[PDB]
Amino acid sequence: QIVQGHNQVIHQYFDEKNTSGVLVIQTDKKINLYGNALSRANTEYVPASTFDMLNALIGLENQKTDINEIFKRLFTAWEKDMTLGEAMKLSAVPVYQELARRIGLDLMQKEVKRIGFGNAEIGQQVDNFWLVGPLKVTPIQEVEFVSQLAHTQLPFSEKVQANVKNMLLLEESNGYKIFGKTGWAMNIKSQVGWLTGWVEQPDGKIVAFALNMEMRSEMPASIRNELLMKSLKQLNII
């Protein structure tokens, strides 16, 4: 069941910011859509840095890296030695590009097709297909992927999935944990912003989300997290 959720308030959150966006929520066997541009939920976009979740899974599963490896730029914040988990937190593109080159094109295409992530097209450049195309994915497809990660239902080892989940913890309070990954594809004709993840409630219940919106260069990166938290509170998910 995919349905519009009844929410006047979340539509207004997107409107106030003069942006077009959608929030996709998956619980149990229900997907609900919120926001002011619900047609975005079935629209294909580059995954941008959200692909780091799948890149990490493939690399760990195939023993191209491990969680303790120290990998020795656009942002000064990237200009340092770091682990795969620290690269996840910082969205350090060059670390993920190095991992992708280790995986190589043959393995990468085989794995993305096996998973069926989005359109599953990687083309011929192994180091940037998730940033500039041809790989594209819908917000509904992203919520389904991350819900499977959260439930350890992807077709990877249980330990590898647990290790990637542990890299994704964003916030917690009152026993609720929020896991996820941001992405932003800048310097294109319509900028796309992502925040895809899940809430783990105190009893262990999982509520998955994918926020997908049009970005502007004037916005702070944190607008994605702010809109997500306001929306999740409004829905009583946190």
Ligand SMILES: *C(=O)[C@@H](NC(=O)/C(=N\OC)c1csc(N)n1)[C@@H]1N=C(C(=O)O)C(=C)CS1
């Ligand atoms: C991931 O989305 C990644 N974004 C980029 O590398 C891009 N631009 O940043 C300069 C990009 C991807 S496709 C395109 N045309 N441009 C990182 N994303 C975040 C984030 O929080 O979303 C960052 C911390 C900066 S770079």
